[PDB]
Design a protein around this ligand. Structure first.
Ligand SMILES: [K+]
Ligand SMILES: [K+]
Ligand SMILES: [K+]
Ligand SMILES: [K+]
Ligand SMILES: [K+]
Ligand SMILES: [Mg+2]
Ligand SMILES: [Mg+2]
Ligand SMILES: [Mg+2]
Ligand SMILES: [Mg+2]
Ligand SMILES: [Mg+2]
Ligand SMILES: [Mg+2]
Ligand SMILES: [Mg+2]
Ligand SMILES: [Mg+2]
Ligand SMILES: [Mg+2]
Ligand SMILES: [Mg+2]
Ligand SMILES: [Mg+2]
Lengths: 235, 35, 57, 88, 154, 53, 31
RNA sequence: GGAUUAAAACUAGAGUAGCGAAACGGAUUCGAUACCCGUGUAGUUCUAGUAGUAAACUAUGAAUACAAUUAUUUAUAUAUAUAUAUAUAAAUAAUAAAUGAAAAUGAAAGUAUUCCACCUGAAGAGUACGUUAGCAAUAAUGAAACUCAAAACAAUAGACGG
């Protein structure tokens, strides 16, 4: 049959309807006693100009098409070259949109900081008026303004404590919950495995059919999936 | 002592108990006990 | 000569990502060592408030 | 991730390039800059093979192009003169 | 990896020279098949799975969590003040792999130097890899298999 | 010889592994954050001795 | 190579340098 | 392919104490274009460049896996009846094995694997010619003819040593 080769497109878009394909064949080199790969670039006809640099293609022998062209593209085995072209165009649009959004979020942050620098009022001073007015009874209009600078309509000892909250405090509680879950899951499964009877019951209670007839790994995974379905789904 | 310390140069325990309603929920607790 | 000659070291001039990060480092109240001014103002106010509460117990 | 590594290298490359522009005789740190730029090329070349979509997105955001990444680069004297690294 | 196999063959030679009774090799399928053939052929006293610190006494399932710390532990044999496993060399090298048809393997076992491979000697073991299985050359000839001539052990 | 060379992690094992690893990274970040605040507190205590006016 | 053998190369280099100085001088007068 | 690259040297502009090719003198000597002494120019210094060479040496390319000991430091870690002790690495020194023409190497010059550079008798010769590069000195590349049966290394025993 017609001689067919597999190769990588190494040049495209330089000649009209012609691409350069790199074909590698296996040969034996008697001198060094080693089976080597021999490489050759083929000028190949691309009637539809579909192939792109980087594509893996199969080329088939044809009639003479020019001084040096004797093969044509017969199939695109892998279209990595075509993918490269599509992803580059999308990237330009995708990145422009993201950069526009980030540029607007930077100017907004700058405006807020500039606005705050125009308000001579300071947190410490404001928190020293909400704690003196709340301990003296005075209600100068500054407080009403302070009830707008911060949004704190009510001036109580439990409102300054909520104006000065630090994110670290929230992190400290999320971390304790995370540690609890892991510790509970491990103790639960550890105990369950120690008692085969309580384990068999555990599985049946959660909806396993004849858990007794199961393997150690085929069933410990069920136990693990259940212990993690009784401490993460209920919570 | 932590939050309930007498040192002039205290640690972050005191500031944490304040923002966690502990130095206040203990002051009331002690006072309620005194009552 | 019509090729897109992009500096392989510094990249295209006026890249929005490069410029914005540079600008952020030169903002008025940027702090070092991982501190942010907003967290430092609340923390310093909390110290004062916390001291008053410890002086009211 | 390769995209993060390239971005982190970009920051250091930008800082080191600024140093070199003021210390054009500091060949020790010029060599360090060259190696770092080549390291960034290496990580991005792998990214193009591993996740082409992310690759093209990353280089566009960093201000580079495919040629800057694939082509052999030595940051040699001709580069310093063709891109006016030191100015005048 | 043929490189890993080369490392193991050299390692066994080094251990034999000093006459250590027990040593470890990397934990991989190829290494395990290689060691198992040596064990069945009487070159190794023992073959145990284990860790970086020693052979396992009780079965330890291998998983991604501990794969990096796994090792294969092999016992070397010595009789009459001579090592049983004196030499261990690759035939098919990383930079020059040798694939032979069953016809050429029969010539190699018959005294004919094929592709510069010295023929099989009395009491020597030549291993062949076919479809990712390692077997003695005589067994490959029995199964009419063509394969890569990996190494020779004496 | 018949034993499989490697047993892949079950989906559940990978979930518990990710929980521990996320916890490890979060705990270290928190401990560094708290250390920095404790240094900011000890610097506030001495800033009365520093001159800015 | 030993010092003894190095000395043979040393002599050849000296004679080449001596000849090139001699040629230079001539060029100066002939120029 | 690129970059950097001692000393000498070169192109400009500064500097010039001391040192110091050369040169001119003083000695020594049978002679002394030397060794020693004097006066001491270039140079040695700085700035901006050219050039890319050294016994540029460990005369030993880089990477990886691995093999028997001791000593001594260093580092990290651990413990305590708190200052040592126990661990794991690195460096250095002396070694086993192994290798080697031997001298010796010693974690490589050992056991192996991968990649690069390089060699194929002496002399002619790193010369000639050409080419490329440089302001230049030069640098890189780099032969053949003729002639010979030499030529070289480690080690041994002598002889000799102002
Ligand atoms: K035609
Ligand atoms: K090269
Ligand atoms: K001078
Ligand atoms: K030296
Ligand atoms: K090399
Ligand atoms: Mg690299
Ligand atoms: Mg030599
Ligand atoms: Mg001058
Ligand atoms: Mg003199
Ligand atoms: Mg130069
Ligand atoms: Mg020279
Ligand atoms: Mg040289
Ligand atoms: Mg030197
Ligand atoms: Mg390296
Ligand atoms: Mg020359
Ligand atoms: Mg000798």
């Amino acid at each position: 049959a017609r001689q067919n080769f597999l190769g990588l497109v190494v040049s495209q878009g330089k000649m009209q309807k012609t691409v350069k394909v790199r074909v590698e064949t296996k040969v034996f080199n008697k001198k060094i006693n080693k089976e080597l790969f021999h490489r050759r670039d083929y000028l190949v006809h691309d009637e539809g100009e579909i192939s792109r640099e980087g594509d893996l293609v199969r080329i088939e022998a044809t009639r003479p098409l020019s001084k040096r062209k004797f093969f044509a593209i017969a199939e695109i085995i892998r279209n990595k070259g075509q993918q490269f072209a599509l992803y580059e165009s999308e990237a330009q649009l995708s990145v422009a949109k993201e950069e526009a959004q980030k540029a607007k979020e930077f100017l907004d942050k700058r405006s807020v900081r500039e606005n705050k620098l125009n308000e001579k009022t300071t947190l410490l001073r404001d928190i020293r008026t909400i704690q003196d007015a709340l301990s003296s009874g005075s209600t100068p209009k500054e407080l009403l303004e302070i009830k707008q600078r911060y949004g704190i309509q009510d001036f109580s000892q439990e409102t300054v404590r909520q104006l000065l909250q630090l994110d670290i405090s929230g992190l400290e509680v999320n971390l304790e919950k995370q540690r609890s879950l892991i510790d509970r899951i491990q103790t639960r499964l550890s105990e369950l495995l120690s008692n085969d009877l309580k384990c068999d019951q555990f599985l049946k209670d959660h909806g396993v059919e004849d858990p007794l007839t199961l393997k150690k790994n085929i069933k410990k995974n069920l136990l693990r999936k259940h212990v993690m379905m009784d401490m993460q789904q209920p919570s | 002592m932590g939050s309930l310390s007498n040192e002039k140069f205290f640690d972050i325990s005191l500031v944490d108990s304040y923002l966690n309603k502990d130095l206040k929920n203990i002051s009331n607790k002690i006072d309620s006990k005194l009552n | 000569a019509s090729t897109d000659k992009v500096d392989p070291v510094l990249g295209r001039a006026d890249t929005p990502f490069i410029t914005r990060i540079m600008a952020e480092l030169k903002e008025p109240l940027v702090l070092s060592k991982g501190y942010n001014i907003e967290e430092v103002d609340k923390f310093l106010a909390a110290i004062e408030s916390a001291k008053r509460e410890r002086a009211e117990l | 991730s390769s995209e993060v590594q390239a971005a982190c290298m970009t920051v250091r490359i930008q800082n080191m390039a600024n140093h070199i522009k003021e210390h054009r005789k500091d060949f020790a740190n010029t060599r360090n800059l060259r190696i770092l730029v080549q390291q960034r090329q290496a990580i991005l070349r792998y990214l193009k093979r591993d996740n082409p979509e992310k690759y093209y997105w990353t280089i566009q955001k960093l201000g580079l192009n495919d040629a800057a990444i694939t082509d052999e680069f030595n940051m040699d004297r001709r580069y310093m003169q063709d891109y006016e690294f030191f100015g005048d | 990896s043929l490189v890993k196999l080369a490392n193991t063959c050299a390692h066994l030679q080094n251990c034999s020279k000093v006459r250590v009774a027990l040593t470890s090799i990397p934990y991989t399928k190829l290494q395990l098949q290689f060691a198992y053939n040596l064990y069945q052929q009487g070159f190794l006293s023992s073959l145990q799975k284990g860790s970086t610190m020693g052979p396992d006494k009780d079965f330890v399932e291998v998983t991604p969590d501990n794969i990096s710390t796994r090792r294969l532990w092999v016992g070397l044999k010595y009789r009459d003040n001579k090592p049983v496993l004196s030499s261990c060399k690759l035939i098919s090298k990383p930079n020059s792999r040798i694939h032979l048809p069953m016809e050429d393997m029969k010539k190699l076992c018959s005294g004919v130097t094929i592709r510069n491979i010295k023929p099989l000697q009395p009491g020597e073991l030549i291993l062949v890899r076919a479809h990712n299985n390692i077997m003695d050359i005589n067994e490959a000839i029995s199964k009419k298999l063509d394969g890569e001539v990996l190494c020779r052990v004496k | 010889m018949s034993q499989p060379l490697l047993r892949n992690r079950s989906p559940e094992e990978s979930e518990l592994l990710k929980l521990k690893r996320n916890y490890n990274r979060s705990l270290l970040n928190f401990q560094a954050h708290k250390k920095k605040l404790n240094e900011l507190l000890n610097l506030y205590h001495v800033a009365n001795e520093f001159i800015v006016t | 190579d030993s010092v003894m053998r190095k000395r043979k190369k040393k002599m050849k280099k000296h004679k080449l340098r001596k000849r090139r100085k001699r040629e230079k001088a001539e060029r100066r007068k002939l120029s």
